[PDB]
């Protein structure tokens with residue numbers, strides 16, 4: 411087992427700048443609470459060590475696994491036990507249990523202050539004083555709040571963040587240039603985080619096979635002229651990439667992803683002409699381009715899908731003798747014909763087809779039994795379409811704020827045991843599905859909506875698993891990955907839930923609220939709306955509206971009032987009595 415130093419290999423493969431970023435991210439994701447300055451020191455020591463091994467491969471520590479290098483540096487942190495003590499224990503284990511112990515402490519919602527944005531002048535000045543430390547902080551802040559963030563994409567966002575600052579910090583008015591572009595970039599980055607968290611849940615909680623079937627369908631939609639063997643190749647390498655990334659093997663992840671990008675670029679002629687635009691760019695823009703590439707057009711001359719999958723004499727034979735191959739070919743062939751379906755719908759159709767063959771190939775005239783199996787998809791196709799049609803109409807009608815309020819009331823009634831901040835967060839994110847998708851054309855609307863519901867509901871499943879209270883969430887989350895959305899949509903109001911009393915100290919506000927922007931005021935209003943519903947589950951909209959209306963007017967009234975405490979002191983008690991009279 412004489413071998414090439416792994417740390418040298420990786421540093422040589424990704425280059426010093428990406429190496430440093432990737433090591434910072436690894437530490438930030440393993441030790442989410444530790445201050446930036448500790449992480450920086452650790453990054454410095456690992457980088458120095460990588461650079462010594464690059465120079466002499468037989469140097470101290472050069473023959474160790476990456477896991478061992480990281481773990482040894484973490485365990486030589488003098489101020490280790492004070493931040494967790496959970497982790498302190500980890501350091502008495504040997505590899506591999508030690509690495510596994512660090513990964514089990516990744517926290518999906520760490521108890522941290524919310525990410526502050528400084529004022530434009532402040533932000534700009536920090537950028538100009540020290541670029542490297544400034545972008546350090548950004549990787550760290552994002553990585554510690556999103557411990558499964560796709561590491562190479564985080565590097566790419568840090569580039570985009572750098573370009574927005576380079577743009578705006580010279581321009582005349584700074585804030586007005588910055589705020590919309592940084593809000594725009596945060597939005598995209600929270601979507602990236604949610605997509606990747608679902609890749610990791612699928613891999614880690616449901617197996618390599620759940621992720622592979624998902625990637626097959628999505629890549630067949632995106633590169634429908636490519637052939638099955640090529641798609642499957644790409645699925646296999648991407649699975650290895652996300653497995654490593656989701657597991658904190660981030661250097662390996664970035665290196666394997668670059669190789670994948672190079673492979674698709676070299677084979678672009680047999681994959682998609684739309685690759686031309688990506689394949690001349692530098693690696694982070696190159697990979698990000700591939701990652702989100704617009705679907706190719708559907709190729710001409712594809713025979714009716716029913717010839718292979720219903721009419722061929724060998725349908726039962728191919729299903730029985732080569733099941734995964736045959737069903738993978740189904741998913742490919744059906745998906746490449748349907749870029750207008752969502753991935754989860756296509757996976758559901760695949761499961762129905764498989765259940766039909768299981769049943770029918772076990773009878774004495776199977777073709778008799780399964781002849782209509784493609785026509786019988788229609789009910790599974792219409793349900794998602796009606797969901798989209800009816801909720802987009804509801805969105806158009808109510809607008810963003812009241813669409814969020816509708817979903818908050820609806821979700822609090824389905825799963826009222828769920829903690830308030832999870833409810834508020836999840837419902838606001840479902841609201842944001844409307845805004846993103848509802849003005850899209852039909853061709854792309856079902857995919858947009860249902861696969862974005864997928865990532866939002868996974869966030870619910872992940873937050874809930876950390877703090878488990880609702881049996882119904884546990885059931886929808888653990889039973890089926892591809893059935894989650896219909897399972898959640900089918901839940902009615904929970905009529906066995908016992909209403910909680912109203913906490914006196916729920917409308918008690920110290921006028922620290924008056925320093926909040928309007929966007930965070932809405933969140934306080936929506937938090938209060940959830941607690942109203944948890945107290946009177948059958949409360950009407952007009953009732954909820956008059957109480958939140960009366961909280962709106964309290965805020966409108968006191969925050970412009972010189973001496974907001976004397977106001978809030980005298981207006982807040984009268985709100986918790988006026989609420990009882992309405993409810």
Ligand SMILES: [Cl-]
Nearest residue numbers: 667697700701
């Ligand atoms: Cl990718």
